[PDB]
């Protein structure tokens, strides 16, 4: 649960992401893949990427980064009222993609990392606190659907 002030910060920070959704999406995925190589194995269409240079050069990775952050932004803009939006994502990630919740923790931290990297000094303490809570909420609601499905 976030306060309205906190949601306001989240959506303020998100305005930064939306000015360049593909650049942000790209850097998030790269941070995930390089920080946690086992995650790369879950993508049949990225598993070929051996080096970070190849990742940076991949237009399809940038494309998918856009898809991911477009979906996350859709969800964030609901300010917690995201059941309809989140349920299909939980179900596809549990049943088709088979993504353990640990990896959603990974990408959550990666988003925080990227925001500091692209906006040093422009991502204050309050903003980090709000974004972190929002990603925890997102993660926690997915976690509930995972439990329901018996997925580890
Ligand atoms: C903020 C977190 C995430 C969001 C918003 C998100 C969103 C999406 C969306 C919208 C799709 C396409 C529709 C679908 O298949 O349901 C997708 C596909 C996929 N996601 Fe996620 N995702 C997230 C995190 C992750 C993580 C952490 C992993 C793995 C470590 C992952 C693995 C995949 C894979 C393997 C696909 C299918 C890719 C393909 O073959 O086209 N996702 N994701």
UniProtKB/Swiss-Prot annotation:
Q: Which residues participate in heme b binding?
A: 93
Q: Where in the cell is it found?
A: Cytoplasm, Sarcoplasm
Molecular function (Gene Ontology), one example: oxygen carrier activity
- Mind listing the GO biological process terms from this record? oxygen transport; removal of superoxide radicals
EC assignment: 1.7.-.-, 1.11.1.-
- Does the keyword field hold Transcription regulation? no
Residues recorded as bearing Phosphoserine in the entry? 3
User: Which Pfam family, just one, is annotated for this protein?
Assistant: Globin
Detail the disulphide connectivity of this chain as listed in its UniProt entry: none
Give the reactions, separated by semicolons, that this protein catalyses: Fe(III)-heme b-[protein] + nitric oxide + H2O = Fe(II)-heme b-[protein] + nitrite + 2 H(+); H2O2 + AH2 = A + 2 H2O
- What family is this protein classified in? Belongs to the globin family.
**What is the name listed in the Swiss-Prot or TrEMBL entry for this protein?**
Myoglobin
Task: Name the source organism.
Answer: Equus caballus (Horse)
What's the encoding gene here?
A: MB
